[PDB]
C-alpha cells in the first residue's frame, strides 16, 4: 500500500498491485405463490311418519 491507491469512486483503498473494474450490478427476483382451497359440504335429511 505504498501508493495509497484508491478505487476511482473513492469508496475503498486497494493495494498497488490490483485494479478494479466497476460493475455495479444488482439482481432481484421475488416469487410469491398463494394457493387457497375451500370446500364446504352441508347435508340435512328429515323423515316424518305419522
Amino acid at each position: 500500500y505504498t501508493n495509497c491507491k484508491t478505487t476511482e469512486d473513492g469508496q475503498y483503498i486497494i493495494p498497488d498491485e490490483v485494479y478494479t473494474i466497476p460493475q455495479k450490478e444488482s439482481n432481484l427476483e421475488m416469487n410469491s405463490e398463494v394457493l387457497e382451497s375451500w370446500m364446504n359440504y352441508q347435508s340435512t335429511t328429515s323423515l316424518s311418519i305419522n
Partner: protein, 38 residues
Amino acid sequence: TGFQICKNALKLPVLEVLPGGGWDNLRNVDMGRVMDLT
C-alpha cells in the same frame, strides 16, 4: 500516476469508467490498461 493529489485539491470523484484498457473479446471482459493514464 495517482489521482489523489487532484482529489485533495478539487474534492471530486474520479470518473470510474475509462477507456484505454484491454478487452478480451472472446470472454467479453476488461483486462489491464494499455494506454497510460496520468
